[PDB]
A paper describes a structure:
We use computational design coupled with experimental characterization to systematically investigate the design principles for macrocycle membrane permeability and oral bioavailability. We designed 184 6–12 residue macrocycles with a wide range of predicted structures containing noncanonical backbone modifications and experimentally determined structures of 35; 29 are very close to the computational models. With such control, we show that membrane permeability can be systematically achieved by ensuring all amide (NH) groups are engaged in internal hydrogen bonding interactions. The ability to robustly design membrane-permeable and orally bioavailable peptides with high structural accuracy should contribute to the next generation of designed macrocycle therapeutics.
We first tested the ability of our design pipeline to control both macrocycle structure and membrane permeability on 6–8 residue macrocycles spanning a diversity of structures and N-methylation patterns. Selected macrocycles were chemically synthesized and purified using reverse-phase high-performance liquid chromatography (RP-HPLC). In some cases, two peaks were observed with the expected MW; in such cases we experimentally tested the two peaks separately and refer to these as p1 and p2 in the design names. The structures for two 7 residue and twelve of the 8 residue macrocycles were very close to the computational design models (backbone atom RMSD < 1.2 Å). Having found that the macrocycles fold as designed, we next investigated their membrane permeabilities using transwell permeability assays. Of these, eight 6-mers, five 7-mers, and ten 8-mers had Papp greater than 1 × 10−6 cm/s. In our 6–8 residue permeable designs, the number of N-methylated amino acids ranges between 0 and 3.
Residue numbers in the entry: 1 to 8
The structure:
Amino acid sequence: LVXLLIXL
């Protein structure tokens, strides 16, 4: 969702 945070 945000780069590699929270999935993509």
